[model samples]
Target: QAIPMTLRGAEKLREELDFLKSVRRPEIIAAIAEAREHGDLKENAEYHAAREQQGFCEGRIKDIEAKLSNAQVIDVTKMPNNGRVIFGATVTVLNLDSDEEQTYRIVGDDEADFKQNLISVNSPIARGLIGKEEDDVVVIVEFEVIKVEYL
Candidate 1:
């Protein structure tokens, strides 16, 4: 089974992968080369740091490669929208339990950006909203749906 992600989020992952390969990868080698001329490797701080960065670079590249293959791209605009909430739909909710009105865009678990109100599909708020509609009061979480937008 493929993991769900917004179309934009999927593209952003690819963008990050390319940046790590072309830009960050070169910088790591350059740091290592510069360190090699300085002295021996055992005590060289730069060499160790460069090696660490190389490890991180390759690890992330492999992770992204795996991610891309598993990603299920979600395009909200292309999909016909009725009233029910679905993944990638941004919803405005009034949480009676928290007594706060918050906006949330549903995204994949690993792609949450809580600062901007991007909530993971596995979150309590999103889980409550997943099948409900606007103007409906969620029973389990006490979140009232104010509006749902594909934008």
Candidate 2:
């Protein structure tokens, strides 16, 4: 499924990439070098630990780079408030059964964070709500029409 993320998220990722490359990368390299110079590489726990940390850092760098190359960043603030549900739009939903309301921003899978109320567009709840409007009842399961409203 296609991922949808705001430009802000893309910028945050770029900033993280820069920090990792300039700060974390050098720190890991120095740590590994220092450990290696301690000698007895086979028996040195510090050297093995540093090597493992280096591997993780390198893998994360590569992963971020790959995502950056292919990311389709969208600016939500620039989008017209045309009263339509779309990616990057904050949506509000009401639990019909519980009479409780909650808000969420529909974002890409990679950027989805439940703690932040960011929902993946591909999620069942989001799929049921997309293209819907205020006071619209979106039914994900039988008799469970969740109220969908755009922010």
Candidate 3:
């Protein structure tokens, strides 16, 4: 299955990719050059730091490129305002076990952040919730269904 992400997340990633290529990569190169000008390659702390920074930036660029290439990015805002759960739905559920309610948005793995309430579509919670309607109660019992819902 293709990973799906919100337009906002995808746009943020695109801006990051651009920043890496334009600002970050060039800054790292300039830092490396400045460090090299200091001479003493054997123990130049600045040089080592610059090199590490460059590696991280380059790696992140590659990661973002790969994800954007492979992802089926979706604009949740463009979706119908249907009162049902589907891809990219920001769902609210009640923990039947604890009686606490929580909200989570269905997102792609690349953009998933549980702290931000973004859950990967492939996750157990998301899979259980997919296609469920407002007020639907899903019993997630691969282990046990601990949540109840009212949309």
lDDT of candidates 1 onward, in order: 0.88, 0.75, 0.79
lDDT of candidate 1 over 1-151, digit per residue (tens): 9789998788889999999998999999999999999888999999999999999889989998998889998988887667679999989999878888988899986578888799989888788899888888997658799888887
Q: Clashing residue pairs, candidate 3?
A: none
Q: By lDDT, is 1 or 2 better?
A: 1
**Model 2 residue pairs with clashes:** none
- Candidate 1 wrongly placed segments (more than 4 Å): 97-99
Q: At residue 38, what lDDT does model 2 achieve? A: 90
Each model's RMSD to truth, in Å? Answer: 1.4, 2.7, 3.6
Write the residue-wise lDDT of candidate 3 on 1-151 in tens digits.
6767778779889989999999989999999999999999879999999999999899999999998887787776675566666777778777666666788888787778888888988898889888776666778832222232322
Across residues 1-151, which tens digit of lDDT does each residue of candidate 2 receive?
A: 3345677678887988998899999999889899888999999988888888889888888988887877888786875565567777777777776776788888776677878898888888778777776666766732232333334
lDDT of 1: 0.88
Best by the TM-score measure: 1
TM-score of predicted structure 1 = 0.93
Model 2 / residue 50 / CA error / Å: 1.1
Give the Å error, residue 53, model 3: 0.9
